[PDB]
Amino acid sequence: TGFQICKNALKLPVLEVLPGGGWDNLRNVDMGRVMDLT
Amino acid sequence: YTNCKTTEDGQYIIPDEVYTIPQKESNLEMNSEVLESWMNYQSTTSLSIN
């Protein structure tokens, strides 16, 4: 799950915001991966 | 640091047991001011007699 391979192949920077990630609605803050991102 | 990660906007090398979620900025300036100035003046008498 290391994007470094093709971030190295083609020189673009990876997007920072990503949806596949849990989120606490009470504390209102991101929590952790849920949907895997390859 | 085995499969050594890196933050998405790659300018760091996080260890592969942590993940980051990037955002911020905030600042605030504020100042105040106070001045003054005062003055005064005089008095006079005179008598020339005889």
Descriptive notes:
This is part of a larger assembly, with 2 copies of chain A. Chain A has 1 helix and 2 strands. A two-stranded antiparallel ribbon of chain A has the order 1-2. The first copy, chain A, is of the alpha+beta class and 38 residues long. The radius of gyration of chain A is 13 Å and the shape is elongated. It is classed as toxin. Keywords: pore-forming protein, pre-pore, macpf, toxin.
Please summarize what this structure is.
This is part of a larger assembly, with two copies of chain A. Chain A has 38 residues and is an alpha+beta fold.
* Subunit arrangement of the protein: part of a larger assembly
Query: How many runs of DSSP E, i.e. beta strands of chain A?
Result: 2
Rg of chain A, please? Answer: 13 Å
Q: Estimate the global geometry of chain A from the Cα principal axes.
A: elongated
Give the percentage of residues in beta strands of chain A: 15-25%
Distance between the termini of chain A: 5 Å
Strand order of the largest sheet of chain A: 1-2
- Percent helix among the residues of chain A? 10-25%
The H-and-E topology of chain A, N to C, reads as: HEE
Q: What's the total helix number of chain A?
A: 1
Q: Helix/strand-derived class of chain A?
A: alpha+beta
Largest sheet geometry of chain A: 2 strands, antiparallel
Largest interface: A-B, 13 and 11 residues
Subunit structure (chain B): Homooligomer; predominantly forms a homooligomeric arc-shaped pore complex instead of complete rings of 16 subunits.
Protein name (chain B): Macrophage-expressed gene 1 protein
Family (chain B): Belongs to the MPEG1 family.
Organism (chain B): Mus musculus
